[PDB]
């Protein structure tokens, strides 16, 4: 288990928690449904994202209809379970890079505001340069390398409904010395359509936990990016307005 270690006087400021949840580190797993689209037709929101300078921090963000599904369960007066999974997708295989399972979700509230969740899973080589956005549905990527270029797919599962968003990402060719190479295409983590179909993909077997709430994880990712020389885009600043 990854833990953050070091002197208190080197911490960033942490925004207050959004929702007090319990990580059920012992919950027993189900295989990952295939992210490939074949026999179940889906509408997909397709976005494009391009970094314009080396080591640029970027965010994969797109409004979805997730609330219209959550609030259908509210009108039914049903709590629900959910799953969030990010993939890097190629025609031959798909690599899950972030995966979370949610239980006892109150549909009066927003996505992710659920009493329980699984371990919060990440590709281990992304933990210091990646985190969720504030509503837990976006992905922040610090110091990408050129090899990050390609197709990213987010699958949100709410009860028995699924939402797909694709991001076509371009990163320029100059080298970023702050980056980590993810080797996204490695067959240990890049799983074929057949492997998903046969029910054989279990994220606990190859992703790693970073069981810190979003506000703490992103605060650290932004702090480490700047302390290593990165130029933080104003998009990732917080509002102080007139206060303090």
Strand partners, 99: 85, 121
Give me the long-range contacts of 160-163 (CB less than 8 A, separation at least 24).
Answer: 161/69, 162/33, 162/42, 163/64, 163/65, 163/66, 163/69
Contact assessment for residue 139 and residue 105, using Cβ atoms and an 8 Å cutoff: no
Q: What is the 3-state secondary structure (H, E, C) of 200-232?
A: CCCHHHCCEECCCCHHHHHHHHHHHHHHCCCCC
Q: Residue 15 burial by CB count (10 A; 0-12/13-18/19+): exposed, middle or buried?
A: middle
Alpha carbon distance 146, 175 (integer Å): 7
Range of the domain at 82: 1-244
**DSSP string spanning 128-182?**
TTEEE-TTSSSEEE-S--GGG-EEEEEEEEETTEEEEEEEEEE--SS--TT----
Q: What's the start-to-end Cα distance of the chain, in Å?
A: 37
Q: What is the stated resolution of the deposited model, in angstroms?
A: 1.9
Radius of gyration of the chain (CA): 18
Backbone angles phi, psi at 119, to 5 degrees: -50, 150
**DSSP string spanning 45-92?**
EEEEEE--STT--EEE----SHHHHHHHHHHHT--EEEEEEEEEE-SS
- Angle made by CA atoms 142, 179, 176, in degrees to the nearest 5: 100
Q: What is the enclosing helix (H) or strand (E) of 122?
A: strand 121-122
Token representation of residue 214: 């979003």
Contact assessment for residue 143 and residue 230, using Cβ atoms and an 8 Å cutoff: yes
- Which residue, 204, 28, 219, 197, is CA-closest to 99? 204
Q: How many domains is the chain built from?
A: 1
Token representation of residue 110: 């927003």
Alpha carbon distance 142, 199 (integer Å): 32
Alpha carbon distance 56, 130 (integer Å): 13
Experimental method: X-ray
Q: Is 236 helix (H, G, I), strand (E, B) or coil?
A: helix
Alpha carbon distance 101, 23 (integer Å): 10
């Amino acid at each position: 288990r990854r833990v953050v270690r070091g002197n208190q006087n080197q911490r960033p400021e942490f925004p207050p928690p959004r929702y007090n949840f319990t990580i059920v580190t012992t919950y027993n797993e189900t295989s990952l449904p295939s992210p490939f689209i074949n026999d179940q037709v889906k509408i997909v929101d397709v976005r494009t994202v391009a970094a314009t300078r080396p080591c640029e921090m970027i965010a994969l963000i797109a409004k979805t209809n997730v609330d219209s599904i959550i609030k259908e369960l509210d009108a039914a007066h049903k709590t629900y379970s959910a799953r969030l999974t990010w993939f890097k997708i190629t025609p031959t295989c798909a690599t899950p890079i972030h995966d979370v399972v949610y239980m006892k979700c109150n549909p009066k509230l927003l996505f992710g505001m659920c009493d329980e969740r699984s371990n919060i899973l990440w590709l281990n080589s992304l933990i210091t340069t990646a985190a969720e956005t504030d509503d837990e549905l976006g992905l922040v990527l610090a110091s990408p390398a050129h090899s990050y270029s390609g197709l990213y797919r987010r699958v949100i599962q709410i009860d028995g409904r699924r939402i797909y968003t694709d991001f076509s990402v371009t990163i320029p060719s100059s080298h970023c010395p702050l980056s980590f190479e993810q080797n996204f295409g490695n067959p240990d983590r890049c799983k074929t359509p057949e492997q998903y179909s046969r029910g054989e993909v279990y994220t606990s077997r190859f992703l790693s936990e970073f069981n810190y709430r979003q506000g703490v994880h992103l605060a650290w990712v932004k702090h480490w990016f700047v302390q290593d020389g990165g130029n933080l885009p104003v998009q990732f600043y917080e509002a102080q307005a007139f206060a303090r």
